[PDB]
Design a protein around this ligand. Structure first.
Ligand code: UMA
Length: 431
């Protein structure tokens, strides 16, 4: 889509809002942004060129917009947004922007509780088949931070909020795991209004994975030829053995998790991966190794009042930004950055590195550019080990050593997992 020369206004300066701001700036469009909160988390992350209004909405800005991008945290029913809509001003959310740009199929997942687990599993099933997969959305990493012409499949966890502002989603496979009322303050007209939001996920979906045990997850107008279902004792995928299309496929003894819940999660996940075209071989393997939703970070050592945190999986700028958001650091943050990154996306990261309590240790191929984000507090070495031996004598009680590289590790390691193990070993010897 073209946004050149449009008056764009973004509502919400949280993770989503910031991703949108960067999305637009990276296309030569300077948006105006607002948030009803006086000091939203992304306020100090904006470039000075961006006009901002916080503490309330600025209605003149909204009414003068060509496009309004509304974060999930504000309701379309808000009088300011209702007014803009009546005047015919287009309103979209980050997921909508994402769908317009995506060049790979999308598996979409929504429902209430357990959403993240099913999303994560589908992601693993894709990893097992060797698919460069991008997992994001409501699960944590804003969808727009995943855009990459290298990505071969996207797995998105979506909230009813994101769904209300999305119109161009055409999922290869979509599901509403269940419909259980939550966030009802955002749906004052009842369960039907609430159900309607989730149902949007099936619009133009190639295959709709439905919950045989929850009739509300069926698209309105009964189930069609696109619908495949999962359930405990009923459905295309059901239950011990996992039954699929009438044929047993796996004895639950082969998977690490147990319990009904963990089984229907595995079934819903398989139904989605089958629909997305992933080989059942690899999907089943993933089901047999899956040990659940991983922790956000791996604490490799906590000694002398210092925490050494491994987030080697943050292979891009958006992930590192996500790791830094709301990060509690009692003393100084010794941030490790480096490897093979996407230089085109480095500039915005500098805005997350301000303050008197942050030190950068940059290494690898793009270490020089990374260190250049804020030279005054950065050290530059060739390897991560050198960088760590550098910081070791410098840490004091209360500090945090964080490996959240913002780059891939292929220039010096076999994979980010190995880079993380290296970090674990070195932290134990040095901390
Ligand atoms: C509220 C919400 O939808 N949160 C999701 C959102 O995070 P983000 O930080 O971008 O949220 P936001 O839209 O800025 O809203 C955050 C908070 O500020 C408030 N808000 C937002 C804009 C504004 O003008 N005024 C205001 O008061 C919202 O009411 C909310 O209290 O985008 C992220 C990336 O997609 C999601 O991971 C994140 O999910 C969290 C984990 C969540 O609680 N989501 C709900 C929906 C859920 O899963 O139950």
């Amino acid at each position: 889509a073209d946004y050149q020369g449009k008056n764009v206004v973004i509502i919400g300066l949280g993770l989503t809002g910031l991703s949108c701001v960067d999305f637009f700036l990276a296309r030569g469009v300077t948006p105006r942004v607002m948030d009803t909160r006086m000091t939203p988390p992304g306020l100090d992350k904006l470039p000075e060129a961006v006009e901002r209004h916080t503490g309330s909405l600025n209605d003149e800005w909204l009414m003068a917009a060509d496009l309004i991008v509304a974060s999930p945290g504000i309701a379309l029913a808000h009088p300011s947004l209702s007014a803009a809509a009546d005047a015919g001003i287009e309103i979209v959310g980050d997921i909508e922007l994402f769908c317009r740009e995506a060049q790979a199929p999308i598996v979409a997942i929504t429902g209430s509780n357990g959403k993240s687990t099913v999303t994560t599993l589908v992601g693993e099933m894709a990893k097992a088949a060797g698919v460069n997969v991008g997992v994001g959305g409501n699960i944590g990493l804003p969808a727009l931070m995943l855009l990459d012409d290298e990505c071969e499949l996207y797995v998105l966890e979506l909230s009813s909020f994101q769904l209300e502002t999305t119109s161009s989603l055409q999922a290869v496979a979509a599901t509403i795991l269940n419909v259980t009322e939550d966030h009802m303050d955002r749906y004052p007209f009842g369960l039907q209004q609430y159900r309607a939001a989730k149902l949007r996920i099936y619009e133009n979906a190639k295959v709709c994975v439905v919950n045989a045990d929850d009739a509300l997850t069926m698209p309105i107008r009964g189930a069609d030829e696109r619908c495949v279902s999962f359930g405990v004792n009923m459905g295309d995928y059901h239950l011990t053995w996992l039954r699929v299309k009438g044929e047993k496929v796996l004895n639950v003894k082969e998977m690490k998790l147990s319990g009904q819940h963990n089984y229907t999660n595995a079934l819903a996940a398989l139904a989605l991966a089958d629909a997305a075209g992933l080989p059942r071989a690899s999907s089943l393997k993933a089901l047999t190794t899956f040990t659940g939703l991983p922790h956000r970070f791996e604490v490799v050592l906590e000694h002398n009042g210092v925490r050494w945190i491994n987030d080697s999986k943050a292979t891009n700028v958006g992930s590192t930004e996500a790791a830094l958001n709301g990060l509690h650091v009692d003393g100084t943050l010794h941030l490790l950055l480096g490897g093979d990154g996407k230089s085109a996306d480095f500039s915005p990261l500098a805005r997350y590195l301000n303050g008197d309590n942050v030190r950068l240790y940059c290494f690898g191929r793009d270490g020089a550019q990374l260190a250049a984000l804020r030279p005054e507090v950065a050290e530059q070495t060739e390897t991560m080990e050198q960088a760590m031996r550098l910081l070791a004598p410098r840490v004091q009680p209360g500090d945090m050593v964080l490996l959240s590289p913002a780059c891939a590790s292929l220039d010096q390691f076999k994979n980010f997992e190995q880079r993380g193990n290296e970090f674990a070993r070195l932290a134990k010897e040095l901390g």
